[PDB]
Symmetry: C2
Subunit: 151 residues, 2 copies
Amino acid sequence: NAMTHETDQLYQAVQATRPLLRNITAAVERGTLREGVTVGQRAILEGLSLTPGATAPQLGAALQMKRQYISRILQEVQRAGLIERRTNPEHARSHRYWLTPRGEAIITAIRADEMAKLALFSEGFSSVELTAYHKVQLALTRFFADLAKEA
Amino acid sequence: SNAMTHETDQLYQAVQATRPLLRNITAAVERGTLREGVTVGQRAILEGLSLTPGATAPQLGAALQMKRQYISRILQEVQRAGLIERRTNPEHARSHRYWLTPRGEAIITAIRADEMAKLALFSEGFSSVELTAYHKVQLALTRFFADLAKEA
């Protein structure tokens, strides 16, 4: 039973993952709507910022999102003039997408606002505490993945 | 890039892991629950009734932050499996109140013992100070984003 206090505490942290994800999404949306876009649209803009010229299937794999969802969001951001499609002379059906200057400006603004807010949050903790958070967060992700594949 | 960029880039990567983490937790938990013959959703209801014996379905819904349709579906599954029972509510007949059966009790106990033993295995890889920092920052982040969502 010597580990009980620690596992009770860790379980409480693990249980906060679900409300945390809901709160991240809702907080993110506050910032994205100021730039006229949704959270889902932001995800696609961030994806194309990271990999200019990606295909819809590639974006789906990178963002771990279903084809249907990627397809809908691509249409929304394209209609809004935030991305453009260029021809793919190697494989014509493999449509490739790039941010437009406006889409670039929007995702840049969103990211700067988000990092400024993360900086605010971080001011309340030592870098040692935050580094421990990161290490444990990633190790838990790994740990549960392994249990799901193996146990 | 100002002096905080390294730290916020790292924290951002941690925040971004929240979605695959929740997926992986759910998948890992399901491995344990199916060994005792139940699903993850069924486990959530058994755990809720373990914590508050005699709860109503709306009370469980509020405690678990789940929709009434979902709670209703799961309550039927566990009742059909003989894991919970409904008792009469002579104060408000409409307000059905539920309790674990001894079988439901055995199952959720077994699931919880297994989950905690696996959390202890994980925890062996870290100092208690690291894990405490994780808990503190986890809960502080939950609050921080809640506040942004309500206020910004």
